[PDB]
Structure formats: structure tokens, C-alpha cells
């Protein structure tokens, strides 16, 4: 009737923020140009995780970010390893092959417009397909450990001073 | 190793459960083994201990004995007593939908499993309906208790399955109640529709149709559980009519549920409305046609410093 | 984005038409009682294949079905292996279990309806299911050659019997050879008991129309016709399986010249002028290039 | 393509005697007192223009030479068929000619791969396939064709395929190299062509159907993936094995085993006009967004093909709707492909507004995006695979069964 697909548990890291590590507001801000905010808010406003969040997480979301300088070929990501970190779609032409029981196939191309790797936010995940770079740009390597940390001991301040 | 093996039961994400026979008695019983592996490469032990620390001072009729556990150099092996019979999800399947009166006993079961947990302060967590055995007197029981938790309290804990969620896990809300709420308002619809209740070929929708909250009126539904589908999908939880901290003075007073006499069926006396058909020991009939994979025992001591709880 | 799919190639078994030799009627031969037939019947008019199918097949495969006796615990067909069989559950109920990523997990059973492997008869591809015994049963179905052979046979007798009786009338000379396949393609059946009429008087006759098997007495009624009085059966043109009648209808345009009878069981065909007007449009223009022959 | 003597039914001389009848005919006929639908209006025109030039020989003589041009074209076109048919070919190939590189994609049927010339060096494409499968199978006949489509091309759609060369136990057929890539994946990244878009694939799928049928070879096979996309702005077909051409009817079902039209599936005859029913669904995903069949069972998908019903979301165009409208009932009898010449009420539909085919005929105008070429070996926009070498022993296995090749 159907092929039935397998229904593997989803979880992760329990980050429990109230007696957990050693620092304390460790936010490692990242400034950067003012125009590059501008152009990346355009697309920041629209996600499902920023159309419903405080003002002053999204502005500590757009402050912090890294930046990383991807040349022409390069297998920086492969399906396999485990996946920790959200790219967005800043600029230039990049191939999405998945490797579909072990054959490849473009899934979609993303040539500064869209928006992908939010999934790797959502849980524990592996790579969602190869990133093939088909020339030269500037990608952001925002890392997993970062947002779930801040995004919720915002809101457990909230709650206990609020 | 005192346990012969005879042949592999399950294999999953959970891990692997193959049946033995006790030397010291001869009966047919499930062993589990925990494996490591992905424990290690997934960071699971929280859950594991968590899990442990809830059956040291915990026994009810909707629960699987904990009789010999077998901690070795390297890997871990849980018995328990087996239940010949299967899943219903299966017979679910090869059928197609139950009757009301299915449905009105699963609804009975569940509210007696959550009044159960809440009474000892506990959480089920993860719910799917590959969690279930139906013997042949009649006594269900649940099996994959892991994904648990001691005390309620307040926390940020992310698992289950995709199938299965709510704009509070999303983004973690406490989600107390609402995580064992209102994904089981749509549990009854894979039990009451002829197809699957999500059907997408790419997760984005399946999560837009969790946040969108709309159940899609099926072309051949009772006029009885559609006014209580229409309301049980809800982002809070106190504007519910039907939702007192009692649990009893809500679901027996509602319109097609009335007549649950959860007094008889507490005590595990009424029998089951569809009982298996038994052959001989171990029956596989209800059961796939999986295989075995490749097995293998412990060489030498890895990870044995992990559970030293014991 | 999207789960996707395959592109796999599909394959179906070949035949050789110009091959007419074949069986005199069937080869296995095993008549059941009148009750297991009925239900096989009533079993089968809900598959899809038997909606247009005509009660001389059905009695074919009927007369030629197999029936196959499987005891408790018995096991033939399996999974992986070129399906080479098919079978359908008279009685009984039987799991069927089907792979799925190394597990063979179930799809359901049938009680008195079913057919395990119908689609294996549409096109040669591996077995995609696994068969398990349960309790003493019989199975009735047929093999997959044979199915196809009898198909095949049936097919094209019923496309070689019908154009030679027409190709006798030496009106047809603007038909192609291959507009005779869509013409003979075009044409249906209808069948009409005693007292049945065919079509009401003073009707429009702008068509055509050759009766397939049953004698037919076209009459009208006596008035306008110098003739008896008294209506009877006026000897207009007795239509057999060979003769034809309508053909005169197009450049005449005569009065209304009478109204066809069905006598008992008649069997006739159902053409249509509006299938024939798609390619070469209305036959009053086709039929003016032989004015040789009526001028 | 009215022509002026079969508007009123007149030979060669055209006198004052069928004139006045077919005039009264048309008056009776087309009347703008009564009717005043669309597209009479026109017929009438075409009707008046082709009465009053009937009676003038100095206009009707362009439209004489034209049709006997098209005739001497057409005869001379069946000519080169029936030699080509009657001539054979063979023992024209060599192995130890090109090398392989790697795979570009395996099939149930054969393997695409890339291969380089020792001689002078240049990429290609060459099909790979094994006899194994096919003694199994038995399927000569349509390996057969492939031998006469070899030498039938004189097109330029038609792809000009190489010398192929016949081994032991392996079969090998080189092509033209496709830099670009196929439209299947485009499609599926894409998912929602525009109107221009939209339009040229219309033109071509209708062009490529009209050189079809001008041979009166039927194509049978039919899929996404035989639809390729070259760097010169253009689209090729591929895997012509399934063509033939029989006299009679025919029973080898393969090919469309999903797009399949209700009149096939209960194992009975067809003609070419069911290879625009199995790709008119193919337009559908050109449309909406979704795959046609929202199933996975062939139960549902056959329930879903005989059941005729079609969605009619807020994306569709006004012409489309209404030539998906039109061809809805099972028993497709009044197709539109089954008529005289077949190219009328399809190219004077409202979908072609506007068409140009002598544009497209010498090969002239440029596609609205060309796919990148990225130099030679250019195999980014093709889908990769895994690779594959021939692992077979050198060993005769049932020679006379392929000697024809």
C-alpha cells in the first residue's frame, strides 16, 4: 500500500540552562558593515523561527555571525558526518547534491535567494546534502551551539524577572 | 551471557531486542540490548539514567517487569518478560480503521496511563503507536520508556518524532501537558481516517500543518467526534473545557464518552475487543518477516565507566 | 523539497500475431459446481479488467482456470524471484507480507475476493509480495502465459473477424488500410431482444448501420405505398449476417423508407457518422468521386 | 493547408456549376446574422477568400506550386526512407577506439557513460548494454529498429547516432555529447515555468510531434528523462530503440507505464495519439507545482487515471484550462490529434496565439536560457553516479541471435 518510511527518534543535546558550564554572557559579538545587515535582514525577517521572536534576539542574532571565504571546488560539507551548522544564502551560485541512496542529484540551486539550513537548528541531524560551490564567495558559518544558548536564556530571564 | 538466544525480536534507532530462553527455567523473554554506539555518537545517556532512576521506585499494570539486567565490559543487556502477540499498528494496517468502541478503549487507556504517570509526577514524552502489546487475557502493556523524565519541573528537552509535535516543542515552551496533548488529537485521526493523518512529501509541510492548526474533515467521519476534533487542536491549554488536573471529571462526562467504566477496566478484568490468534510459542504470524543481522559480543572493556550506578 | 522517485524501465511479455496456430479450446480443464463459479463471478465483476469483457471470456476462463490446493505451513513463492504465477483466494484468509528496507512488513489479507499478483499479469516484473500458508485452502487463478495467450487470441479474433464482411461491398474504396483498424476499432456491439425496436418511425435516418448476427425484417406501414390495406410484414430487405442496409441514405434523401425489427436475440454493431466526420469529414463529398458507379 | 480546390469541391478546371452550391453551403452554414461565436468568423474569411480566389486563376497559382512543392518534397522525403530502409549497414566499429572515463547513469535498460577518442580526443557519450538481461527478456525486435534508425536521420531534431559495435556479451553505441543537462532536473528544481518558457516547450514538443508523424514512426517510449538539453540551446531526444513502424496493430506494452490512458490498460490497441495523453499529464507538473499522481500504489494511480477528475488550482492559464476541460471522458474519441494532416486545430487553438515554425526549421533563434558551459567535460549540470566497470568474461554467448547490427 506504502512504502512505510522508518520514524527515528529526534533528540539532542537536553540544554538545561541553570547550573550548566562555568561563564556567564558569553554572547562573542561579531560586528560587521552596515549595508550586509541591511541586505541579510531582508531575508532574516521572514523565517518561521524570527517571524515570532523579541526585537533584541533578532538584533543579537544579526550582530553575531562569522563569515567564511569559499573558493571555487571545495567539499567543505558531505553527506555522512554529523550536521552542526547553519549557512544562509548570502551570495553566489551554490549546487545542493543529495546523495539519494548513494547516487547524486541536484536538489536546488541557491544563487542569493532563499533560505536553507534551518533544519540543522531543529535537531540532531547529519548533513542534509553536499554544498558545491561553483565559484568564489563569502558564506556566514553560524554554528548550532550558539543559538539554542542565548535564544533561551533570554526568554528564562524573561520568565523570572518578568 | 546466560541467556540462549533464538531469535532477533526488533532493530531500530532505539537499538536491538532479540528473544532468549531462561536456562534456569525455560521461558520465552525479550533481551534489549543498549548497544552504546549511538548512545555515545548521540549523546543518550540523561535519558538512560533518567529512565533508570524512575523504574528504581516504580511498578503499575501498564508497565514491563525489570527481572535479571546484565551490564558487561562493554555493552548492556535489559530482559523482560515477552508478550506474544504484536502491535496493532500492524492490524491496523492490514484492515484499515476501527470501530467507536476501539477508539472510546483507547481513549480510556490513555487517560489511565496519564493519571497513572501524574500521580508519581511523570512525563511519557515520546508516544507512537509502535509502543503497544495486546497478550492473549487481555492486559496491554507499553514498552520504550526512555524518553522520560523524574520530575516535571521545568525544562528544555527536544525528541519525539517529527510526526508528532507542537509549536511549543519548536520552540521550547515547558510544554508540561500540551506535548502528550494535543499531538494525541491527532493520534485518534490515524486510528479514524482510511490514509495516514500527515501525507507530504517534504517536512516543510508537515510542519506547516502542525503550526496551522486545521483537521481536514475526512469524507466518511462520525458527526460524534467531529465537534471534539474541531476543538482539540488549541495553542493554550486553560480554555479547554475538558481539561480539569482530575482527568476523570471530563472525559465521563462527555457526549459519546459515558458509558467507560473505568472501574472495571483499572482493575484489568474486561477483555480486550480484539485478541490475538495464538499458534504456539513465540507466534510470528502478527509479527514481520524481518531478519537477523549481524550480531556480536563484547572483546574488551570501552565504555564500562558510563552507567556506574550499579 | 520532495521525497521523488525512480524512472525505472517497465517491460511486458511479446507475442507474435502472424502465430494462428494455437489450442482448440483450453488446455487444463477442471469444472467446479455451480455456487464456487457464481462466486468467482461475482468476485471478479469488481475488478476493472471484467467491466468490458463479454460472458463468452468470462466462460473461457472460467472453463480453463486452475485450482490449486495449499496445505498448512506450505511455502512456494517468494520474494526476489521472477513472478512466473498468479493465484486468487476463494476461501480462507492469508498475510501477505511485503519488503520494506530489509523488513517484510505486512499490507493485509483477503476473505472470498482479492487477487494476489494481479498487476504481475500486466507486465514481467519481480515478485513484489511473499505468500504465507495458514490453514487448508484452494486458491483458483491462472499462470501468467497462458493468461496473456488466451488475451492475446481473444484480441485478435475479434479484430480479424469483423473487417472481411465488409470489404465484399464494393462501396468502400475511399477507406485507407489504415483507416480500417479505426473504423473496425470504432465499432461497437449491441444487442437487442424480441419486440425490442431498434429506433421509432419518422425518425431521421442519416447514418449507417450492418447487422452482425440475427435475421432482421424491416417493415413500415401500409399506406402511402400502393399496397394492402391491412398493415403487415412488408418485404422491404431482410437483413442477414452478410447483407448490409443505410448505405443509400446520403445523396437519395428519399422518404421515410421503413423501420427495422429485432426477432429475438439479434446481435448488431453501433456505428456512429460523428467518428467518421473527425478525419475525412462528411461522406457526401467522399462518396462524389465514385459518380461512375451511380451517376 | 485549405486548399482552394477542396474548399468547394472542384477539379481542375474550376467552373460555374459546384460554385453556387458550395457558396449557399457556406452561407447556410456560417452566418453572421445568427452565430456569433468566436472562431466562425474566421472560417468564414478563410471560405469567402478561398471562393473569390477560386474564380481567379492568377491567385489560386501560388497555392498550386506550393502544394506541389510539398508533394515532391513529401515523395522525395519516402524515397530516402525506403532506400535507407532497404540498405544496410555494419562492420563499420572498433574497440580499442575509445576510452572510458566515468558513469553518467545506469538504467533498467542500459548505461550512459562518458568516453574520450584516442585519436583525435574529444568528449562523448556512449550507451552500454549487456545481452544478459536481454536473453532473459528476449527483446530483439526492438533492438532490430535500432540498426535502420541508425541511418534514418535526415533531420535535425533526429540526433545522428554513430556506428555502434556488437562484442561477446556487450553492446556499445556512441552519441553526441550533451554539455548541458536534462529537463526532468531542471523541472524538479524549478517546479513553475513562466510563459515564454512555457510557450517554447509547447512549440518544440509540437514540432518534434509533427517530424514524428511525418515519417509515421511511432515513438512509443515516452519518459522525462528522454528529453535533453544541448549547449546549443536546443532539445534532443533519446533511446529510439522502441520506434517501429508495423503495418498492423501491435501488443508490446512498454514504455509509459504510469502515464498510461485508460484505452491500454485493459490490454488492447492504441495509436500516436496516446503519446500527447501520456505527456499532457507531464504538463501538469509544469503547472501546478506537484507531482500528478499523489499516491505511491498503482491501485490509486490506475483509480486515479480511469476516475476522470483533474484539479484546477489558482495557477493554471485561461487557455490551458480550457484544453484540459476539453479531454476528460475515458473513451477518447474526438482527439484532436486523430485528424487529416493533424496540425489545424491545434495550432489555431487560443493557446498559439502566436507561432513561427520556419523560424525553428533552420535553427535560428536563441533559447531563453542556455544552460552554463563551463568548457569541455562540462558535467556539473547532469546528475552523478556512482561508478561502474564491465566486469564480464570475454565469452560468445548465442552469436546468430544478434547478427544484425
Known sequence: ?162 | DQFERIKTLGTGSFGRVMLVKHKETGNHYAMKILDKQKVVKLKQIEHTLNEKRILQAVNFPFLVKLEFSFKDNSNLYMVMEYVPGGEMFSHLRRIGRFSEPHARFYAAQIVLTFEYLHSLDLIYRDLKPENLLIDQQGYIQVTDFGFAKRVKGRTWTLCGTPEYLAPEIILSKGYNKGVDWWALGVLIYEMAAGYPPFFADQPIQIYEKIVSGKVRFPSHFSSDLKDLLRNLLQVDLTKRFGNLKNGVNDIKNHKWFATTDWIAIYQRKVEAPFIPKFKGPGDTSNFDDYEEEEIRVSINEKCGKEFSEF
Not at chain 1, 33 to 40: E, G, I, V
Open chain 1, 1 to 162: 500500500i506504502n512504502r512505510f518510511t522508518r520514524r527515528a527518534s529526534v533528540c539532542a543535546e537536553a540544554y538545561n540552562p541553570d547550573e550548566e558550564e562555568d561563564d556567564a554572557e558569553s554572547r562573542i559579538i561579531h560586528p560587521k558593515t552596515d549595508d550586509q545587515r541591511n541586505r541579510l535582514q531582508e531575508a532574516c525577517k521572514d523565517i518561521l523561527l524570527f517571524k515570532n521572536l523579541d526585537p533584541e534576539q533578532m538584533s543579537q542574532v544579526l550582530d553575531a555571525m562569522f563569515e567564511k571565504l569559499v573558493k571555487e571546488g571545495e567539499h567543505v560539507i558531505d553527506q555522512g558526518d554529523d550536521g552542526d551548522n547553519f549557512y544562509v544564502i548570502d551570495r553566489g551560485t551554490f549546487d545542493i547534491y543529495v546523495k539519494c541512496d548513494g547516487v547524486g542529484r541536484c536538489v536546488g540551486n541557491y544563487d542569493n535567494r532563499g533560505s536553507f539550513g534551518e533544519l540543522a537548528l531543529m535537531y540532531n541531524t547529519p548533513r542534509a546534502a553536499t554544498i558545491t560551490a561553483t565559484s568564489p564567495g563569502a558564506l556566514w558559518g553560524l554554528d548550532r551551539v550558539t543559538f539554542r544558548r542565548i535564544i533561551v536564556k533570554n526568554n528564562a530571564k524573561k520568565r523570572k524577572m518578568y
